[PDB]
């Protein structure tokens, strides 16, 4: 089948007129079966989420959201590592990309993080990262 990259470029393609739920699903599926899967997938979303093109970032976030909802224990491991949390922080923090980032994209990320501190207490690093955004005042 198509590689993870090909799957993500379609799932987050700036030309999509609507969410490509098909290709998206295919993404969460494929990544959760390769040993190198999660780390790769995780690195790709990070880049997509930081795109200057909002629609490309919004879809990426939707993909991240989706794969996190499946019983993908492996995906939660990668997303739970600061190796990935830092990338989301760079997008919402003013000290980095936070300034040039759309309000829409930043608010979505904050909500995504919250929801995980709730349905995924098992992941402390997420709560840890989320907590820092609180102190900085990012979390109004």
């Amino acid at each position: 089948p198509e590689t993870l990259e090909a799957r993500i470029n379609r799932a987050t393609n700036p030309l999509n007129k609507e969410l490509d739920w098909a290709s998206i699903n295919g993404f969460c599926e494929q990544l959760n079966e390769d040993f190198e899967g999660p780390p790769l997938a995780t690195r790709l979303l990070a880049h997509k989420i930081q795109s200057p093109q909002e629609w490309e970032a919004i879809q990426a976030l939707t993909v991240l959201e989706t794969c996190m909802k499946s019983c993908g224990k492996r995906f939660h491991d990668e997303v739970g590592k600061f190796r990935f949390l830092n990338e989301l922080i760079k997008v919402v923090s003013p000290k980095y990309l936070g300034s040039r980032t759309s309000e829409k994209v930043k608010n979505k990320i904050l909500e995504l993080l919250y929801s995980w501190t709730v349905g995924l207490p098992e992941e402390v690093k997420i709560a840890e990262a989320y907590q820092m955004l609180k102190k900085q005042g990012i979390v109004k």
């Binding site: 590592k81 600061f82 190796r83 949390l85 830092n86 922080i89 760079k90 690093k125 840890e128 990262a129 820092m132």
Partner: peptide, 7 residues
């Protein structure tokens, strides 16, 4: 292994 929390 994992990097530290960004500042």
């Amino acid at each position: 292994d994992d990097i530290s929390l960004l500042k």
